[PDB]
Amino acid sequence: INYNKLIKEFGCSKITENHIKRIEKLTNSKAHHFIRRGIFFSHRDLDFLLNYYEQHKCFYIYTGRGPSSLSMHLGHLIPFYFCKYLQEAFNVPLVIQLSDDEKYLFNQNYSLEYINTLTNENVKDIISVGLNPELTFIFKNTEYAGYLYPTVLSIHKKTTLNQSMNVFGFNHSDNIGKISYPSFQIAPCFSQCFPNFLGKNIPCLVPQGIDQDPYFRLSRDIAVKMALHKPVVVHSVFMPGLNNSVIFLTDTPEQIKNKINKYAFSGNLDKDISYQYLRYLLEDDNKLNEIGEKYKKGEMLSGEIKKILIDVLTELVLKHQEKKKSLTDEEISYFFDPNKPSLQKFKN
Amino acid sequence: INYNKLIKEFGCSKITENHIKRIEKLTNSKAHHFIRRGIFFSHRDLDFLLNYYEQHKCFYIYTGRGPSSLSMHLGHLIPFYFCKYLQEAFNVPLVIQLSDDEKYLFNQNYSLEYINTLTNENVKDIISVGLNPELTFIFKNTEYAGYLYPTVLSIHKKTTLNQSMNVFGFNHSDNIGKISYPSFQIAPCFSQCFPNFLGKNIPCLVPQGIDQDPYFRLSRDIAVKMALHKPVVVHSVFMPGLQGVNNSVIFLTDTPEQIKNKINKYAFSGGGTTIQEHREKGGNLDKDISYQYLRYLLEDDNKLNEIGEKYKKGEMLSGEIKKILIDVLTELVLKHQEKKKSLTDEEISYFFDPNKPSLQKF
Ligand SMILES: N[C@@H](Cc1c[nH]c2ccccc12)C(=O)O
Ligand SMILES: N[C@@H](Cc1c[nH]c2ccccc12)C(=O)O
Ligand SMILES: [K+]
């Protein structure tokens, strides 16, 4: 996949060192390694957002999760780790949508109950990332649709069937729920969908996988029509693989060791899957650079990098499972309260 | 239109004398004149509904209004007079949807605010019909969508885009909100949409204009897929506007004067012809718009029969019938206006409360 080609093809902008310097200046801390290492690499209107934060110290983050399975892996958790950082760095509210409606509509043999099981577990996996419970609002569409609906209607009216089908690749055999859904994913980009804790027309930062862009490329056109702020968009590169070409957060140190040893492509910094995974997982640059140099020059063996990765991954997965098991129902239910005076309520 | 052709074409059935006698038996009161005179004439699954009421003494009514205008007229209020009757006769909950979302999505230049301004007035017109507040729940889709959504999702998933477009005549230029909407009108046909006061899979009676049938022809095929009851449906004929089958209709904002004008200058006369020719010809009830309206407004079958007989035989003048209509209309409209003016904000708010103990029957 040619990312630089995609940026210019769909009208995005590369994240620059200036963006980073301004982020560190405004947050009074070091930028996350996702930004420094170009994992989150492209954006729309980030400059506007940074200036708006500088001038008003106010905005909110919005991301989502589609509960189509019980088994999440690290790639799914990448944007949530990132939202955790943004949440703490700027001290702003985070909003997380669970498109249980989408997964119900797109999966023919799935019922709402099943989707809800998947949803609850995915929610616990997401919370287990380390999100600030005070600065977080999670919602299921099946429950928050009433708060989303007037905004959805405006988006509905400004989206022709032609546009929905062209943008999302729908055909005439798809159910009208699939056609109507994208407005519900677009809606939370507008702060009127959260009257309990947010003011009107507050800029929205949307961290997302690249594959989610069609939703928010459309949201920016409709935002102009609705006379509201265009969603500030931030994209991530797809996490590379190498049928269990992934690391599940239910996996054991044993299975992680086996998968890494037997399947992780080795390589060359750019073809070694393990060094990339370390690019994701290692916060300190010195380490990453040392391992990178030793490996590129030949001093370090493959099985070494494999070992260090297995260690890091093992600690991560174990801590995550611990946090997961630690979760009480009240702790989870707290995340669904929009009435927290707490952070949530200060952004007006 | 040929209604008997429609009945066969779309798989409905005429309401019979057996149905009327049975309704009178179960309600212990005379059947409403809308039924006796074939104004509400066609149905689906009325026998099942009457059996169910005989067995459990309960069901619920569902009808709706699209707030597309500030000025409602008689034809608009026809099914609401009919719902007031059913509500009182059977002693059952009445559910009323205001599809402000529909009218927002179908009218390019209407804001949600303007629409809301419309439905707030439409609601007062609807209530002023004489609905029982204790047995009535009114809701705006813009406010109740959260209660509708899980059911709408199931209906969505069971409707292909092709089917939606073919049933409702949509094209690829229509917004996706218009394609989405029908599931929201279909949703209240299922009691799970009213958890606060309704029980499990309760049979739903939907009185409607004949042009709403595609919604509920679709609701019945979808119920089968959701394993829920098919909506018991009851249709009314179109109320013939003035000037053949402002100002071919009479508004409930009109003054007695305006009604006088409208009738005397625009009511099709049927009998008419030459000043004397009518004395022996004489008067044709089927074409006389006045007698047709009196069919809607006169409860007493005997007055209607007398006026009609005299006007058909020729003794009655077009102007006389005209005048009878002026006074009936005037009384009705004035009464409606007084009732509408008397409405307090709290009385109105009481209609929107889903937690009324009077509604709470499981
Ligand atoms: N539909 C997305 C989940 C999602 C919903 N809202 C979002 C907003 C931003 C990013 C992702 C989302 C998926 O299945 O992957
Ligand atoms: N769509 C109808 C109003 C309506 C909504 N729900 C209904 C249920 C039954 C009959 C009519 C309705 C109209 O504009 O005329
Ligand atoms: K189902």
Numbering used by the authors:
A (entry chain C): 245 to 486, 513 to 537, 551 to 631
B (entry chain A): 245 to 489, 513 to 629
Q: Which of the paper's sentences describe this entry?
A:
Tryptophanyl-tRNA synthetase (WRS) is a class I aaRS and all members of this class are characterized by a Rossmann-fold catalytic domain whose active site is recognizable by the presence of consensus sequences HIGH and KMSKS. The Plasmodium falciparum genome contains two copies of tryptophanyl-tRNA synthetase – a cytoplasmic version (hereafter Pf-WRS, Plasmodb ID PF13_0205) and an apicoplastic one (hereafter Pf-WRSapi, Plasmodb ID PFL2485c). Pf-WRS has an unusual N-terminal appendage of an Ala-X like domain (AXD) which we show is necessary for enzymatic activity. Here, we present crystal structure of malaria parasite Plasmodium falciparum cytoplasmic tryptophanyl-tRNA synthetase (Pf-WRS) catalytic domain (AAD) at 2.6 Å resolution in complex with L-tryptophan.
However, a construct encoding for the catalytic domain (AAD) of Pf-WRS (228–632) crystallized in the presence of L-tryptophan (L-Trp). These crystals diffracted to 2.6 Å resolution and belong to space group P21 with two dimers of Pf-WRS AAD in the asymmetric unit (solvent content of ∼56%). Structure of Pf-WRS AAD (monomer) consists of 6 β strands and 19 α helices and each monomer harbors the N-terminal aminoacylation domain (residues 228–496) and an anticodon-binding domain (residues 497–629). Well defined electron density was observed for the bound L-Trp in the active site of all four chains. We could only observe clear electron density for the bound L-Trp but not for ATP although crystals were grown in the presence of both. In Pf-WRS AAD crystal structure residues 482–512 include the ATP-binding motif KMSST which is completely disordered. However, the KMSST loop in Pf-WRS has a fifteen residues insertion immediately following this key motif. A potassium ion (K+ ion) was observed at the dimer interface and the coordination distances between this ion, protein atoms and water molecules are in ranges of 2.8–3.6 Å. Residues from both monomers contribute to the ligation of the bound K+ ion, which to our knowledge has not been reported for any WRS crystal structure so far. Sequence identity between parasite and human enzyme counterparts is ∼55% and the overall fold of Pf-WRS is hence very similar to Hs-WRS.
